[PDB]
Amino acid sequence: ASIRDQLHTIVYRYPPTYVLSSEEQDLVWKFRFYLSSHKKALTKFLKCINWKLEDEVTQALWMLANWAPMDVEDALELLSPTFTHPQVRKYAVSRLAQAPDEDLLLYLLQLVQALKYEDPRHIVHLHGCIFPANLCTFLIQRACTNATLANYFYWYLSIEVEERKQDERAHDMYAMVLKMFLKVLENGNFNLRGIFYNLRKQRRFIDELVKLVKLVAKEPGNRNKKTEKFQKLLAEQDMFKVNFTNFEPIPFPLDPEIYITKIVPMRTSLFKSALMPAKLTFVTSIAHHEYAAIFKHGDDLRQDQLILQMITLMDKLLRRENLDLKLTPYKVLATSSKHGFLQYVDSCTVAEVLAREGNIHNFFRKHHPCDNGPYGISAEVMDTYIKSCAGYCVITYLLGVGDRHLDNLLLTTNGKLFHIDFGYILGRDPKPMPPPMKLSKEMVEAMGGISSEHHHEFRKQCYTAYLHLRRHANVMLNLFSLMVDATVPDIALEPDKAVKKVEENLQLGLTDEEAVQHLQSLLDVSITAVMPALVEQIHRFTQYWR
Amino acid sequence: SIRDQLHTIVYRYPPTYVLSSEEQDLVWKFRFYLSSHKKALTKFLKCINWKLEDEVTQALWMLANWAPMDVEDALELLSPTFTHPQVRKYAVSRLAQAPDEDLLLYLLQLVQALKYEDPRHIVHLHGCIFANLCTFLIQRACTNATLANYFYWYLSIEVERKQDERAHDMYAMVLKMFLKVLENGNFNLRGIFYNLRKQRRFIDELVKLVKLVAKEPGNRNKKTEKFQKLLAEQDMFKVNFTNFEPIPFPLDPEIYITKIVPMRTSLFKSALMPAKLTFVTSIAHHEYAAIFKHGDDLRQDQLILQMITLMDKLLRRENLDLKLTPYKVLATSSKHGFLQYVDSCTVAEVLAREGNIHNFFRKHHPCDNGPYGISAEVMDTYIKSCAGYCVITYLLGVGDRHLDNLLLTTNGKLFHIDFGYILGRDPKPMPPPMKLSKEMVEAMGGISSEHHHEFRKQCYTAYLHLRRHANVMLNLFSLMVDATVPDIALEPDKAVKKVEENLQLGLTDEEAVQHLQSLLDVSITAVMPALVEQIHRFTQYWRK
Ligand SMILES: COc1ccc2c(nc(NC(=O)c3cccnc3)[n+]3cc[nH]c23)c1OC
Ligand SMILES: COc1ccc2c(nc(NC(=O)c3cccnc3)[n+]3cc[nH]c23)c1OC
Secondary structure (H helix, E strand, O other), X not given: OOHHHHHHHXXXXXXXXXXXXXXXXXXXXXXXXXXXXXXXXXXXXXXXHOOOOOOHHHHHHHHHHHOOOOOHHHHHHHHOOOOOOHHHHHHHHHHHHHOOHHHHHHHHHHHHHHOOOOOOHHHHHHHHHHOOOOHHHHHHHHXXXXXXXXXXXXXXXXXXXXXXXXXXXXXXXXXXXXXXXXHHHHHOOOHHHHHHHHHHHHHHHHHHHHHHHHHHHHOOOOHHHHHHHHHHHHHOOOOOOOOOOOOOOEEOOOOOOOEEEEEOOOOOOEOOOOOOOEEEXXXXXXXXXXXXXXXXXXXXXXXXXXXXHHHHHHHHHHHHHOOOOOOOOOOEEOOOOOOEEEEOOOOXXXXXHHHHOOOHHHHHHHHOEOOOOOOOEOHHHHHHHHHHHHHHHHHHHHOOOEOOOOOOEEEOXXXXXXXXXXXXXXXXXXXXXXXXXXXXXXXXXXXXXXXXXXXXXXHHHHHHHHHHHHHOHHHHHHHHHOOOOOOOHHHHOOOOHHHHHHXXXXXXXXXXXXXXXXXXXXXXHHHHHHOHHHHHHHHHHHHHOO | OOHHHHHHHHHHOOOOOOOOOOOOOOOOOOOOHHHHOOOHHHHHHHHHOOOOOOHHHHHHHHHHHOOXXXXXXXXXXXXXXXXXXXXXXXXXXXXXXXXXXXXXXXXXXXXXXXXXXXXXXXXXXXXXXXXXXXXXXXXXXXXXXHHHHHHXXXXXXXXXXXXXXXXXXXXXXXXXXXXXXXXXXXXXXXXXXXXXXXHHHHHHXXXXXXXXXXXXXXXXXXXXXXXXXXXXXXXXXXOOOOOOOOEEOOOOOOOEEEEEEEEEEEEOOOOOOOEEEEEEEOOOOOEEEEEEEOOOXXXXXXXXHHHHHHHHHHHHHOOOOOOOOOOOEEXXXXXXXXXEOOOOEEHXXXXXXXXXXXXXXXXXXXXXXXXXXXXXXXXXXXXXXXXXXXXXXXXXXXXXXXXXXXXXXXXXXXXXXXXXXXXXXXXXXXXXXXXXXXXXXXXXXXXXXXXXHHHHHXXXXXXXXXXXXXXXXXXXXXXXXXXXXXXXXXXXXXXXXXXXXXXXXXXXXXXXXXXXXXXXXXXXXXXXXHHHXXXXXXXXXXXX
C-alpha cells in the first residue's frame, strides 16, 4: 500500500534514539531490499541486525556497501557506543573523510570524545608501528593536513591527558594518542614539522602567561591594585621566559588563523566577575590590528565550549534555512582546565546598561537615534534585538540553561543581546523554581509590553525558530549521545538522562500546531510572572469569583 | 489564475467589509464570469450602487440571473445599509423559500428589520385595508398558528429620542392590520385571532393578581401563601385560575393549558421575586412548569437565548452536541415574561447541599468503575456543557457570572441562567475573559485531569466551527442595532463590532486556537490557588 510506507516515513525520519522499533524492525527487513531510499534509511536498518546472528552480519554488510551513502551527521551515531561492530565503524569513518574540513571542526570535540568507544587494539597496534582506515589513524592524518585542525586536535587531547576508576583506562589511552600525534609531526616534513613548532610555541607561551597570572593572584589588593600589578608585570621584560611587550609570532590558540605579536599592557583590564579574568589585547602580525581576548584562571571551560559549539551549530542550521537571528557565538577554547581563553565581543552587561542609562530603549536611542520609528530608535537595531531575543529564549530552553541574570546577559550597540557564563546546564538552577523561559521585565519593556507590533513579532520569531530546530534534531541528539562520558559537570550528575532531557525540551511527540501551543504556553507563564501589572490582573480574576 | 484563490478569500472570509475600495470595482471584470457561485452575490452588491445612474440597470440583470441566495445574505439586504427597493424585494423572495422553523429564529430580527423603510409601503397597505416586506410577514403570519403567536407578542411589546416615536407609530399600524386581517379571514385565521384574545385576557388577569401579591407587605412566606389563596379562590378574576378553557401557552404555542395548580406554586429567593407555577397541559394530565417574572424587560435575555439556540443548531448540524440547554423565554411586555423552567439546582445550592460537585453527581448516578464514582457519560455530558458555555459566553461577552447564576441539572448539563450583562458590561472592575469556578475545575479533576484535556479540546473545535458561521450571527446582530436591549443601547454602533472581535476572524485557525488557549490559561490559573503560588515563585526569581 501507500499506508504501508506511510507507517515507514514516520520511522525512517523521526527520532534517532528511539528504542520504539520492535516488531517494526521486521517490517523494514523486507522492504529494505527493494527501497534503500535515502541515507536517512540506513541508520534505522543497522539498529536491528548485528548482535543476534553471526550470519545476519554478512547480508547486511553487503546491503550497506550498496546502500545510498549516509550523511556525515547520521554517520556520527555509528561512532556511538551502541554500535560495536568493527565493520560498520570503518564505514562511518569513510563518511567523515568525505566531509569538508569546516564540518570536521564543528564535530571535532565529539570525535575526540568518540575515541573512547573505538576499540583499544586499534590504538596500540599503531603505537607499536611508530615507537619500537580505522578512525584514530584518520583523525591524525587529517589533523596534519590542515594547520588549524592540528591546533584544535592538540588542545582537546591535552585537556584529556592531564591528571581513579574508568579514568585510568581513558587517560592512558588519550595520553598515548597525543604522544603519537606529536611523533608524527616531529617527523613529517616541512609543513608537518612546521605545525609541531607552532604548537611548541603556543604551549610555552601559555605557561609563562599562567605563571604571571599566578603572581598577580598572590599579591593582595582590590581589583584595581591587582590590575595595576598585572600591567607592570607584562611590561617587565626578562622576568619571563617569553617577553610579552614583544614576541616571536605565534598562532593564537583561540584562533590559529591570526598570529600574535605583542601584548599592550595599558589596554589590559580585569572583569568585575568574581573570578577575576583579564581582558588582554594583543597587536597581531598585520598593521598592528588589535585583538582582545579574555583569559580566565578560576574555572573549567569544557562545559562552556560545549554550549558554544551548540549555539554555533544551531545558528548555522537556521542560517541555512534563511533564518538569521543576530546571535553571537563567540569562540571559547580551554587550555588545560582551570585556564582558558574566550573571544571578547564588545558589549555591555544588561544591568550596566540599566544603571547607566535608565532603560534599554534609552541606550539604543543614544547610540542609534532616528526620530521616526519605531522608538526614535533606528528600525534595524530594534529588529536585530527582537531577533536575538527569540534566538536565545528558544536555544536556552532546549539546553535548559539556568542561573541567568542581568550580569549574565549582554547587549551590544547594534542591538544583539547574547548570553554568557553557562555554568548551569540542563535545568540545574541554584533557585528552587526557575521560570520555563528566561526573560526579564527590563527586556520585555524593550519590546514595548504585550501589544507591540514588536512583541508580537518576537513570539512569532520564537515559534518559527523552535519549529526549525525540531526538524534538525537528529544532529543535536547524536552530538549529545557522544558526550555521555564527557566530564562536563552538569552532564555527570546523571549522564543517562543527559540526552533524555534535551529530547523532552524538544517536544518531538507533538504535532507542529501542538508544539507551538505548548511553547506558547511557557512564554506566557514566564512573562506574566515577570510583569508587575499581569500579576495584579490575575489577583483581580481570583477576586471575581470571590 | 492566482486571482482564483484571492477571489475565494473575498467570498468565503470577509463578513462586512470596507476592504479594498479601489478594488471593489476591479473584481468587476472577472465578476460577470464567476457569478456562478451563490455567496459572490452579497459582495457584488456592495460596490455598484455607490455610483449614480447607470450601474443600476445592469446589476439587477446580473442579480436576477445570479446563482440563487442562501437565506443569510438576505438578512444583510434587509438592513439599513442597502437602500434599493429591488434588492429588498429580492431579499424577501429569498425569505419566501425558507421553511417556517427558520423564520421562527430570524423572526425576532425580522420584526426589527421591518423598522427600516419604506414607510410608503405600510401607508399604502393602510389605504388598502381601510411581496413587499410587511405584507410578507403578515401573510405568512396567518399561514402558521405558532408563528402567528410569536409575531403578535413581539409587536405588542413594541407598540406598548424623537425617532423612537416615529417607528412606534409604524409598529401600531402593523399590529392593528395583522389583527384586522385575522378577523376578516377564513375560519382558521379567526380561530387564531380568538386564541390571541384569550391569551391576552389571561395575561392581564395573572398580572393584576401578581400586582396584588406585591402590594401586600411582609415575609416571603406570607406572600407565597397569599399567592396560593389568590389562585385558589375561583371567579374573583373573570379568568378562573383553578380551571379555565384550553389556551395555547403564549410562551410555547404548541402546548395547551387548562389550569394552574395552586398548592404547587412556590416563590423564588430573589429581591424582586419571580413565581414558579405548575400548569396542566390539555392532554394526558401532563404538567408543564414555567416561571413568571414581574420586574424587568426580558428582551435582552430572549436575544441571548435565540443566539444560544442558533449556535447549538449549527454545532449540532456539525455533530457537536455540546449538550446546551436553551430554555424558552418570552417577554409578554416590558417588566413581565415567562421563562421555561428546567429542573436543576443552582451551583451554590449544590455546594451547601454537597461538599463538592462530584458528591452530587455521585449520589444521582454512581457507578463503582466509572471515573470518579460516576457514570462515564454523565461526566461527559458535563464536560461538553461546560465547553459550550465558555465559548458562547465568550463570543457574547456575558458578564456577572457567579454561583447562583450557573445552574446544574442532576444529569450533568451545565447552563447559565441570567443575562443582565451582555457584550462586556459587568458590575465588577475586571472580568476574567473566561468564567470558571474553582469548583467547576475541581469538578473536572483539576488541570492535571484527562477530562480537563477533553474539555479544552472541545472549546477549540466549538470555537472553530462557530467562526465558520460568522456571517449568520453578524447579520442577525446587525439587525439588532436599534434594538432597545439596554446593552446595545449604550453603544449601538460599537455593539455589533464587539462580537466580531471575539470571533477574531483576522486569525488563521492555528492562531485562533492559540489565542483562545491564552484566554483559558489566564482564567484557569487565576482561579486555582496553586497555579497562582507558582506564578509567585517565578516572580521571585529575577528579583534578588
Ligand atoms: C562589559 O563586560 C563584558 C563584556 C563582554 C563580555 C563579558 N564576559 C564574557 N565572558 C565571561 O565573562 C564568562 C565568564 C564565565 C564563563 N563564561 C563566560 N564575554 C564573552 C564574549 N563577550 C564577553 C563581559 O563580562 C561581564
Ligand atoms: C434552584 O433554583 C432555580 C432552578 C431553575 C431555574 C431557576 N431560575 C431560572 N430563571 C431565573 O431565575 C431568571 C431570572 C432573571 C432572568 N433570567 C432568568 N431558570 C431558567 C430555566 N431554569 C431555571 C432557579 O432560580 C435560581
